[PDB]
Amino acid sequence: HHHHHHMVHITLDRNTANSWLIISKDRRQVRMGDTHQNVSDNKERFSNYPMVLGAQRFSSGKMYWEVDVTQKEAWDLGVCRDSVQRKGQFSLSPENGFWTIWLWQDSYEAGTSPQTTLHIQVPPCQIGIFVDYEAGVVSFYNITDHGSLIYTFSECVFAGPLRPFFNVGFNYSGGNAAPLKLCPL
Numbered sequence: 090h091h092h093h094h095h096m097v098h099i100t101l102d103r104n105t106a107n108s109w110l111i112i113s114k115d116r117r118q119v120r121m122g123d124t125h126q127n128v129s130d131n132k133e134r135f136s137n138y139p140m141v142l143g144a145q146r147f148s149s150g151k152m153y154w155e156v157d158v159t160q161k162e163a164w165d166l167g168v169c170r171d172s173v174q175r176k177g178q179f180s181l182s183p184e185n186g187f188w189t190i191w192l193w194q195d196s197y198e199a200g201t202s203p204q205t206t207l208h209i210q211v212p213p214c215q216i217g218i219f220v221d222y223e224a225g226v227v228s229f230y231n232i233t234d235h236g237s238l239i240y241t242f243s244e245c246v247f248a249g250p251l252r253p254f255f256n257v258g259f260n261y262s263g264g265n266a267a268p269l270k271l272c273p274l
């Protein structure tokens with residue numbers, strides 16, 4: 090792909106984070122804490138899952154960023170509507186305002202309803218995410234495998250501003266403590 094030139098500098102929004110997340114001072118890394126991180130509750134925080142949004146909102150144009158997932162067992166990445174549900178249980182689907190892929194139990198899947206099996210020969214250490222607002226496209230790239238395509242959502246009905254979306258996943262196993270990191274341009 091040749092999307093690298095639409096690179097944008099993404100930072101995480103502390104106020105949206107689940108209360109167990111630890112966001113780095115530069116707002117470029119997030120990981121699961123071993124306890125509640127001593128923050129007040131608010132209507133923006135994801136309550137049920139270890140999720141956080143980017144601060145940036147996109148309503149036009151072409152945007153590209155990269156996320157490091159090295160040595161994680163589970164995570165979700167992509168974009169979502171600014172107005173997604175924050176509280177209670179929900180599925181990651183375009184009907185609920187999410188355009189995402191994930192790793193879970195040694196398989197990669199796209200957040201369609203129902204979910205779609207992905208075919209990845211080279212487990213990614215870094216994922217590239219490309220959004221074309223006008224075209225209604227979200228695409229995912231395997232940076233470890235020379236930028237190979239993972240998945241394209243097309244005919245997307247965004248229906249509002251978009252925010253970068255992150256889930257560091259649960260760490261029930263003790264093997265999923267590693268952070269998500271926004272990679273430099």
Ligand SMILES: OCc1cn(-c2ccc(Cl)cc2)nn1
Pocket residue numbers: 107109121122123136137138139258259260261
């Ligand atoms: O480290 C064990 C661990 C804790 N969590 C967890 C689950 C749900 C929420 Cl809302 C917050 C944290 N996941 N794994």
